[PDB]
Amino acid sequence: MSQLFKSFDASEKTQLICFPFAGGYSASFRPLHAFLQGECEMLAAEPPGHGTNQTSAIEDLEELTDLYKQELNLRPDRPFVLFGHSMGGMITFRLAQKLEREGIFPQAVIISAIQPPHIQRKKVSHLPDDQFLDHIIQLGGMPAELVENKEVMSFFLPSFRSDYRALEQFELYDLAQIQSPVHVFNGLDDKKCIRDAEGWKKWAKDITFHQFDGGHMFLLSQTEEVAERIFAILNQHPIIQP
């Protein structure tokens, strides 16, 4: 009972975007994937029109490899990028992510969105308050203790070493000096310095890394200048304007 457009060819690269938007990440990734990649599966979520067959439910992956390779199933697409909104959808994501990890462990391209304010309880020498807010998982007031799991798996928390080692359990004490695959960070409207600190700490930058933050923090909202400022420079990060 839902609409969902999709168009894959030779299983190049899966691109899931439910009601996306140009903004800046789109104009930045556009040329990034258009210059580094090409002929990639293009799909997106559409509004309800008329009962045709069934509801999307983010099942185009199999629905495609099956409705096309019905004759014989070999293997789905390795890469997969899912773009969501700043609202929240642990459900839709739960199916997508689960479908990915279950579809193929060794993935190349992968984008995480809806990055919640909460952070995997850990200890870092980033700031004297980092650990505080890390265990507080509030950043504006957000009561949740029995969802930290469904969030790290669905919401896709920012904490890389956490989720990573939580889904691979192979992470080492050293993660610096790493680059090859493709990935991008989306959301982090609340905290942005968290990813910049915990991100640069490893000095690792995949062949294609991007950062798209909004700004809804307690102070971020107060100073609209800083907000719009970051957004602009963010869209010009990869390509500066004349």
Swiss-Prot record:
One of its GO terms (cellular component) is cytoplasm. Belongs to the thioesterase family. It comes from the Bacteria. Probable thioesterase involved in the biosynthesis of surfactin. GO terms for molecular function: hydrolase activity. It is found in: Cytoplasm. It holds the Pfam family Thioesterase. It is an enzyme of class 3 (hydrolase). It comes from Bacillus subtilis (strain 168). The active site is at residue 86. Its EC number is 3.1.2.-. Keywords: Antibiotic biosynthesis, Cytoplasm, Hydrolase, Sporulation, Stress response. Induction: In response to low temperature. InterPro entries: AB_hydrolase_fold, TEII, Thioesterase. Pathway: Antibiotic biosynthesis; surfactin biosynthesis. This is Surfactin synthase thioesterase subunit. The gene is srfAD. GO terms for biological process: antibiotic biosynthetic process; lipid biosynthetic process; sporulation resulting in formation of a cellular spore.
